[PDB]
């Protein structure tokens, strides 16, 4: 593996048909027999690992202990028609058969899988690199074909990305994707987060901040994968282990708890449909259920208690599952604003930014970057701004001890961490906790869950308060959430048009009060009339209440103007009221809703069209890649896959800096400097080597 | 074929075969596709309408019960909101089909201690149910056309 | 897919599809690794014929 | 119509240079090319 790593280092910054690449190909040809021997050593054991798991092999497996004889192995393995005589003999020799010629094939298959994995992967990387940089050497396809099984086995783990390299050229990078990273990426919640992020950027984002947003999303997703890892499942100690198990159980099943709460609310309301009010006990009145079964009354009480419990558990699961991500994101943005902007060193927001004003409470706290990974942010800010703004002033602002920095660099102290609750008491950072609780209580999802819990509690004071939890169907169902977004899209326009309707109805009220008062008698009686327009407030209420809801306007309700000195004036009054209020303004409301529908639909279509017509990374359209068949699909799955950039970021984070290669160090330094010039913009490997490849 | 067979049991079952005009005529098939395109959205908005009408039913049952006497007689009243099921049926049946909402059907709240509460009740019912949700249904159809 | 299992071993599986040698091809392709007799039982073939 | 007018104006301003008319795609070959072109090279405020 070390030798192959040296070879790969020789291939750094190597152009297509490069001298070093062709020299390496010639060297491999010079040792063709040995390279074939190595590739054969790998492929026989790779094939054995899957053969021993085959039903055809298990048919020959007959010993109850789980073993197989050498002769049985011989007749089973040549039945697969995959190895030759010498290869089967070699496998028999390598098998540690006992004096009874019994073979433990379970351990035999797994003996060399782990030891050979690293060298196998590096051989796959080397052959892939040579094949993609010397594409017209007939001697190399023989090695590629002999290494077909190795390449196929390592295909899911061989990640490749393209960067703008150290030499002002597009370079292709090969690295290793781990099984855990790929599996965590393929989780449905992470896929949904990816879809949401893609929609946000492609819809309401620009080209300038796109790569910044993508990297921020990658970091957030890495933190989410860590959260999933911790919450995943395979006297103080016992209570602690049970507590963390219970909290992880709540976190894993948060959405099932939400669905259960919804179902419980539905059941409670279905029972509530049977309520009946009677003056007789089951001058005030009694409310009671009216059913013959007799179990609905206890069932309602049980369901109410269970619904309250489920709501409380949902609150707990949320604060164990999403609150860490909220805090992580806020801490990260605050740290970057401190370092790269000096938000509280240079600009000092002008009291109109409630978020920035609230973040001041956390600056000097001992545990400010609790979730954000960078614990040295205060050090970096000090080193960056202390010379110009004062080391002591910066230290006071960030709550640092200047004397302790030296000793922390000096050595490490190992104190006694006593596992006592009394000692745990003052170990709490009260100011940081206040800041965190403010951040949480300003969060929309937490606020919704808290309102849900509060309404559940009020449901015990009065069971009809459980009707409010039926509104949870709006966010529980994505389709209903979209339909309601189709109303909330133009909410300000709807409010403004309602206010305009109020104003125009007020003008009509003024006219009616001044001139058409005799027509607002809504009393069939002759001696006590009920005049609706003898007061401005009463007339305005009458208009806004009956005229707007009337199909033909106010003229439907007020008296007939036939045979009056004001007949024409009043018919103009009624007709204009009908046209402006009933027709035009209500039609405006419907049109605002309908245009919101159309706008949302075309947003979805535009996002899909952009994703299917342009590369998310380089921006080159699908038309260029379609010159070669399936070119865009291969470009987005192998060349510029964004999942591969995310995996590369995780790979850099996990890998040791002293083990970083030249390209990896380049990208890592650019990442830490927050410079996104390594992302290919408007150029790709195929474009750069058009003449050579074609 | 089954409906044709049932038509011999009762000739009025032959009316069902008139629906064959939907697939026999391409234009009508397209017009009906203009409805079936957003069928899930229409079902969801109908369910939402049911939920909001249920909330209004709950409010009416708890507070505005005296206004649901639909009997002109003086000694035997027909109270429509003395049971939750009856009140919910009354709302979903008459309030949705009424042009001005439930306030068109229920009694006049003039000169009552709950006048303003009831006018807010009626106006919000008219705006949310009669205007907004029905407009959403029409818009789903029209967007399917487009 | 669960319903298509009933037709695999039937003598007249490709009645309308033109390829009458599909069972032969599937056997030649997968019998070595998964068992000629098992594939023949799955597809209802007589290896002797 | 009013909504699509606003969208069309925004799209034209974000996709073409107001002065030379060359589209953002040409300037995007160099990263941030259109932004730098409209802030330094062909800024209309600079012509004013
Ligand atoms: N740079 C890019 N990286 C990844 N995908 C890209 C890129 N540029 C464009 N795309 C598009 O992103 C889309 C992502 O695929 P999508 O998430 O819809 O998969 P899918 O159809 O659900 O697949 P599966 O069946 O495997 O679940 C692809 O259709 C691809 O064309
Ligand atoms: N020749 C040009 N000169 C100036 N702007 C141009 C030109 N061609 C296109 N534009 C576009 O004009 C837009 C003008 O920016 P705009 O007035 O929207 O700024 P803004 O987002 O409100 O900025 P700020 O945050 O600084 O107030 C830019 O987005 C730019 O892409
Ligand atoms: O997203 C990240 N970027 C850099 N370093 C990190 N450590 N842990 C997570 C990290
Ligand atoms: Ca090194
Ligand atoms: Zn690309
Ligand atoms: Zn220009």
């Amino acid at each position: 593996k070390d030798m192959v790593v040296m070879l790969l280092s020789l291939l750094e910054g190597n152009v297509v048909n490069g001298m070093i690449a062709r020299q390496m190909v010639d060297m491999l040809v010079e040792s063709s027999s040995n390279v074939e021997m190595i590739l054969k050593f790998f492929d026989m054991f790779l094939k054995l690992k899957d053969i021993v798991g085959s039903e055809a092999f298990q048919d020959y497996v007959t010993d109850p202990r789980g073993l197989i004889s050498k002769k049985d192995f011989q007749k089973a393995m040549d039945s697969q028609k995959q190895f030759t005589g010498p290869e089967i003999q070699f496998l028999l020799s390598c098998s540690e058969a006992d004096e009874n010629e019994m073979i433990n094939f379970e351990e035999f298959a797994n003996r060399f899988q782990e030891p050979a994995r690293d060298i196998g992967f590096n051989v796959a990387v080397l052959l892939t690199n040579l094949s993609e940089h010397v594409p017209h050497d007939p001697r190399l396809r023989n090695f590629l074909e002999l290494a077909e099984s190795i390449l196929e086995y390592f295909r899911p783990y061989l990640g490749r990305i393209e960067i703008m390299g150290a030499s002002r050229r597009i370079e292709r990078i090969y690295f290793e994707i781990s099984e855990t990273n790929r599996a965590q990426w393929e989780m449905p919640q992470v896929k949904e987060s990816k879809r949401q992020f893609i929609f946000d950027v492609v819809n309401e984002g620009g080209e300038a901040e796109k790569m910044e947003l993508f990297v921020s999303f990658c970091e957030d997703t890495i933190f989410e994968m860590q959260i999933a890892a911790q919450i995943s499942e395979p006297f103080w100690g016992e209570l602690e282990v049970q507590r963390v198990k219970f909290l992880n159980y709540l976190s894993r099943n948060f959405y099932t708890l939400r669905f259960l709460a919804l179902f419980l609310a539905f059941a409670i309301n279905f029972i509530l449909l049977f309520y009946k009010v009677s003056d007789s006990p089951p001058n005030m009145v009694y409310y009671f259920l009216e059913e013959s079964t007799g179990y609905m009354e206890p069932a309602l009480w049980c369901l109410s208690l269970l619904h309250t419990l489920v709501a409380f558990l949902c609150i707990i699961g949320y604060n164990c599952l999403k609150v860490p991500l909220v805090i992580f994101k806020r801490e990260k943005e605050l740290a970057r604003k401190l370092e790269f902007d000096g938000l509280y060193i240079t600009e000092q927001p002008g009291d109109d930014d409630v978020k920035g004003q609230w973040d001041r409470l956390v600056l000097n706290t001992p545990s400010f970057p609790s979730n954000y990974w960078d614990k040295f942010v205060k050090r970096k800010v000090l080193d960056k701004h202390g010379d110009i703004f004062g080391r002591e002033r910066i230290a006071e602002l960030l709550g640092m001890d200047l004397a302790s920095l030296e000793i922390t660099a000096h050595n490490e102290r190992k104190p006694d961490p006593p596992p006592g609750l009394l000692t745990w008491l003052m170990s709490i950072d009260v100011k940081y906790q206040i800041w965190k609780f403010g951040v949480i209580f300003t969060d929309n999802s937490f606020l919704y869950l808290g309102w849900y819990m509060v309404m559940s509690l009020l449901g015990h004071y009065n069971n009809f308060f459980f009707a409010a939890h039926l509104l949870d169907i709006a966010m529980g169902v994505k389709t209903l959430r979209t339909i309601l977004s189709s109303v909330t899209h133009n909410g300000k326009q709807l409010v403004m048009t309602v206010g305009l309707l109020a104003v125009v109805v007020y003008l009509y009220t003024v006219v009616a009060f001044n001139f058409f008062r005799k027509f607002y008698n809504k009393s069939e009686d002759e001696d006590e009339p009920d005049m609706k327009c003898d007061d401005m407030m009463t007339c305005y209420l009458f208009h806004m209440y009956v005229g707007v809801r009337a199909g033909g306007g106010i003229g439907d309700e007020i008296e007939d103007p036939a045979g009056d000195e004001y007949e024409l004036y009043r018919v103009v009054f009624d007709i204009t009221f009908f046209f402006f209020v009933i027709v035009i303004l209500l039609a405006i409301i419907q049109g605002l809703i309908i245009d919101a529908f159309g706008e949302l639909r075309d947003q979805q279509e535009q996002v899909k069209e952009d994703m299917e017509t342009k590369c998310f990374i380089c921006g080159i359209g699908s038309d260029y890649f379609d010159t070669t068949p399936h070119g865009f699909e291969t470009h987005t799955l192998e060349e510029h896959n964004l999942a591969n950039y995310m995996f590369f970021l995780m790979y850099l984070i996990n890998k040791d800096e002293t083990e970083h290669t030249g390209q990896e160090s380049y990208v890592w330094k650019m990442y830490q400097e927050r410079c996104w010039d390594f992302f290919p913009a408007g150029d790709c490997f195929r474009k750069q080597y058009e003449d050579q490849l074609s």
Side-chain angles (χ1 to χ4, degrees), chain A residues 35-93:
Chain A
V35 174
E36 293 171 358
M37 212 157 336
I38 294 176
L39 296 177
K40 202 57 186 179
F41 178 92
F42 290 144
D43 71 1
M44 323 169 24
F45 290 106
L46 284 180
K47 287 162 57 182
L48 181 67
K49 177 58 181 299
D50 58 71
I51 282 186
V52 300
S54 180
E55 299 82 8
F57 190 83
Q58 296 292 334
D59 294 354
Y60 287 88
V61 175
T62 314
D63 194 306
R65 298 167 297 178
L67 310 180
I68 177 174
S69 69
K70 296 184 60 178
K71 155 214 64 43
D72 188 20
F73 194 85
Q74 169 71 239
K75 62 167 50 59
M77 282 282 333
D78 56 4
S79 178
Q80 307 286 142
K81 324 308 301 311
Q82 283 195 326
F83 298 136
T84 69
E87 300 168 19
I88 296 178
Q89 297 300 323
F90 180 76
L91 289 177
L92 287 171
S93 60

Side-chain angles (χ1 to χ4, degrees), chain A residues 458-529:
Chain A
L458 277 193
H460 296 294
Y461 191 79
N462 197 1
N463 295 335
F464 282 114
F465 279 109
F466 280 110
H469 300 100
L470 276 202
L471 283 174
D472 198 28
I473 217 59
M475 312 66 190
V477 182
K478 54 303 190 193
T479 307
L480 280 178
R481 192 157 63 256
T482 58
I483 296 178
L484 266 49
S485 65
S486 177
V487 152
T488 61
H489 191 5
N490 298 329
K492 190 175 185 60
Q493 285 74 50
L494 288 178
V495 174
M496 290 312 344
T497 188
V498 167
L500 177 67
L501 170 60
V503 168
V504 303
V505 168
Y506 173 72
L507 292 173
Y508 277 96
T509 302
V510 167
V511 174
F513 185 71
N514 288 288
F515 306 103
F516 304 128
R517 236 160 38 233
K518 34 175 306 314
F519 297 113
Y520 287 69
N521 192 341
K522 296 299 296 299
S523 178
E524 66 281 352
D525 170 287
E526 325 325 318
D527 58 21
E528 39 106 7

Side-chain angles (χ1 to χ4, degrees), chain A residues 656-661 665:
Chain A
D656 197 311
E657 295 192 11
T658 57
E659 299 296 329
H660 281 171
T661 73
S665 301

Side-chain angles (χ1 to χ4, degrees), chain A residues 398-585:
Chain A
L398 301 179
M400 323 162 64
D401 195 333
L402 310 85
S404 300
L405 309 182
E406 287 78 8
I407 61 177
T408 51
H410 293 6
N411 205 328
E412 186 63 33
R413 302 300 127 181
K414 258 69 68 178
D416 177 69
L421 299 184
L422 174 59
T423 62
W424 180 86
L425 201 293
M426 50 312 302
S427 66
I428 262 53
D429 191 7
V430 160
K431 197 177 182 183
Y432 178 85
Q433 296 300 329
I434 296 178
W435 171 84
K436 184 173 67 60
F437 291 139
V439 178
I440 296 175
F441 268 75
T442 49
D443 189 7
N444 294 329
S445 300
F446 178 87
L447 278 176
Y448 177 73
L449 292 188
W451 166 88
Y452 199 92
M453 165 79 279
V454 159
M455 284 288 114
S456 193
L457 289 175
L458 277 193
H460 296 294
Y461 191 79
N462 197 1
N463 295 335
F464 282 114
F465 279 109
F466 280 110
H469 300 100
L470 276 202
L471 283 174
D472 198 28
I473 217 59
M475 312 66 190
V477 182
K478 54 303 190 193
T479 307
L480 280 178
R481 192 157 63 256
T482 58
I483 296 178
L484 266 49
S485 65
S486 177
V487 152
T488 61
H489 191 5
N490 298 329
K492 190 175 185 60
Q493 285 74 50
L494 288 178
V495 174
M496 290 312 344
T497 188
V498 167
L500 177 67
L501 170 60
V503 168
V504 303
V505 168
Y506 173 72
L507 292 173
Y508 277 96
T509 302
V510 167
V511 174
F513 185 71
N514 288 288
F515 306 103
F516 304 128
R517 236 160 38 233
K518 34 175 306 314
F519 297 113
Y520 287 69
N521 192 341
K522 296 299 296 299
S523 178
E524 66 281 352
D525 170 287
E526 325 325 318
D527 58 21
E528 39 106 7
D530 186 9
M531 306 282 339
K532 285 294 183 179
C533 204
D534 282 0
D535 194 318
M536 254 318 261
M537 217 99 74
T538 300
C539 204
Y540 185 56
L541 179 62
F542 178 79
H543 279 74
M544 287 282 291
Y545 179 48
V546 316
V548 179
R549 300 188 304 107
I554 198 59
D556 281 0
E557 318 290 290
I558 52 191
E559 206 211 6
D560 186 335
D564 190 72
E565 84 287 329
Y566 280 168
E567 166 152 18
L568 256 299
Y569 294 123
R570 158 94 182 285
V571 309
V572 173
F573 180 84
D574 300 350
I575 282 180
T576 56
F577 188 99
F578 166 73
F579 268 119
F580 295 148
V581 166
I582 304 302
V583 168
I584 284 182
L585 286 183

Side-chain angles (χ1 to χ4, degrees), chain A residues 103-278:
Chain A
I103 301 180
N104 192 330
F105 59 92
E106 294 84 344
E107 66 91 12
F108 183 30
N110 316 337
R111 191 185 309 167
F112 309 107
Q113 288 305 297
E114 180 64 28
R117 194 185 188 279
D118 218 344
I119 175 59
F121 175 78
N122 285 268
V123 167
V125 170
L126 178 67
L127 292 179
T128 301
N129 199 323
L130 289 178
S131 60
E132 294 181 357
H133 288 70
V134 194
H136 295 327
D137 200 320
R139 305 167 302 175
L140 198 55
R141 312 65 164 101
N142 180 32
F143 293 140
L144 269 310
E145 292 158 353
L146 292 170
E148 183 269 351
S149 59
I150 296 96
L151 293 174
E152 179 63 30
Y153 177 82
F154 285 109
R155 170 164 293 107
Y157 318 117
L158 206 155
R160 48 168 75 86
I161 68 170
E162 298 177 7
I163 66 157
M164 176 64 24
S167 57
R168 313 312 67 50
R169 294 196 311 268
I170 287 291
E171 303 177 358
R172 185 163 292 176
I173 297 183
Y174 307 90
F175 65 100
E176 180 179 353
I177 305 176
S178 65
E179 303 82 11
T180 62
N181 291 345
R182 178 167 291 276
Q184 290 170 343
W185 173 255
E186 295 296 332
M187 281 300 210
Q189 53 276 11
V190 180
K191 298 182 67 61
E192 183 63 30
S193 301
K194 180 196 66 177
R195 298 191 191 99
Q196 174 98 260
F197 157 80
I198 286 327
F199 176 80
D200 296 332
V201 292
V202 189
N203 195 205
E204 48 265 353
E207 94 199 32
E209 79 288 21
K210 191 178 187 181
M211 279 339 309
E212 233 292 2
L213 298 206
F214 175 66
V215 178
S216 64
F217 160 76
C218 294
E219 301 172 353
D220 301 357
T221 309
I222 292 176
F223 189 71
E224 276 188 302
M225 304 173 184
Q226 299 180 2
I227 291 184
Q230 306 138 297
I231 69 176
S232 179
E233 291 287 340
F235 69 100
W236 287 272
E238 189 270 344
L239 68 75
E240 278 291 334
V241 60
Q242 296 301 138
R243 186 188 70 92
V244 295
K245 184 262 175 184
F246 179 67
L247 259 53
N248 295 337
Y249 185 72
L250 261 51
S251 300
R252 277 183 284 101
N253 307 117
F254 170 72
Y255 295 105
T256 64
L257 291 177
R258 288 289 295 159
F259 158 60
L260 184 62
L262 183 59
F263 166 106
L264 262 48
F266 266 143
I268 290 180
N269 290 277
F270 176 83
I271 294 182
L272 258 49
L273 277 174
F274 292 82
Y275 251 93
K276 177 180 180 61
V277 51
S278 177

Side-chain angles (χ1 to χ4, degrees), chain A residues 194 611-612 614-617 632 636 640-642:
Chain A
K194 180 196 66 177
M611 281 297 282
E612 301 301 324
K614 294 189 305 300
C615 179
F616 184 84
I617 297 298
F632 183 72
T636 57
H640 287 178
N641 197 325
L642 61 94

